[PDB]
Amino acid sequence: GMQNPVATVLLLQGDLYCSPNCLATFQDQARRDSFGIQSKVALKTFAAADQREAEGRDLRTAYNEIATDIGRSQQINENIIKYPPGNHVLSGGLMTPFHALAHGMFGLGAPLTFPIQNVGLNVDIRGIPDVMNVIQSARPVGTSSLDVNFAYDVGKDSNASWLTLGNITLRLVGTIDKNASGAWTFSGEIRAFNDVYDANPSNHRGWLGENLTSLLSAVPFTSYSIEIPGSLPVTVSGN
Numbered sequence: 001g002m003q004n005p006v007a008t009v010l011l012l013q014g015d016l017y018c019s020p021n022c023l024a025t026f027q028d029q030a031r032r033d034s035f036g037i038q039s040k041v042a043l044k045t046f047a048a049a050d051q052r053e054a055e056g057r058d059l060r061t062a063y064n065e066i067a068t069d070i071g072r073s074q075q076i077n078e079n080i081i082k083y084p085p086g087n088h089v090l091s092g093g094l095m096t097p098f099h100a101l102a103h104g105m106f107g108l109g110a111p112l113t114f115p116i117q118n119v120g121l122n123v124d125i126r127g128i129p130d131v132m133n134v135i136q137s138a139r140p141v142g143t144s145s146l147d148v149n150f151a152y153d154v155g156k157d158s159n160a161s162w163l164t165l166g167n168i169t170l171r172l173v174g175t176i177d178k179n180a181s182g183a184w185t186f187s188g189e190i191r192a193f194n195d196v197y198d199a200n201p202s203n204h205r206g207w208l209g210e211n212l213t214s215l216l217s218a219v220p221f222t223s224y225s226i227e228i229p230g231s232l233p234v235t236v237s238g239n
């Protein structure tokens, strides 16, 4: 099998970590070794696997391949997988909040990218009064412009992404075509402002739970910026 027991345990735990049981299983591991080697190596593997999912790979395949590669070493220390130095990208998948968590403890404060299309937004503008108020403000019949920003609870769409981002600020930018009737169409795009990730584990207590938050309170962290590049084209109409 593997050249070491850390990789062996990773492969054994694949069915649980690459599932909805990931958090509970990781909490149990962290409790067992006091956020020790196996826990740190698991967390780094999650971040690596998420990175690979962001690049187009299958999560479980990516996870298994990283564990297998760790398995080529006879060593068992926490550096048998290194948190890489370059451009980290969040996939929006199962392991994304773990990747963000990993980044606060291993990423040296470097910015991370969360492509807007990976977040899982499904913004219903008609459900946002401050935006609808601006839409339906003093406008000429014909074409006019809209460019406004609004807070958004990402949990409206993805409890998961929420674990990483919480609230963010979105920008709606485009043009409105309106009738002499008062019927209108908006065509444009949603963009997102950068989000500060506060890597203090007390900010993550609800998700991480009592024991893990306690264990991580002892570990150094550096907060960082999450860049949320790109645009989501959208169309909205009303009266």
Ligand SMILES: [Ca+2]
Residues within 6 Å of the ligand: 165, 166, 167, 168, 195, 196
């Ligand atoms: Ca936020």
Ligand SMILES: [Cl-]
Residues within 6 Å of the ligand: 074, 075, 076, 077
């Ligand atoms: Cl070793």
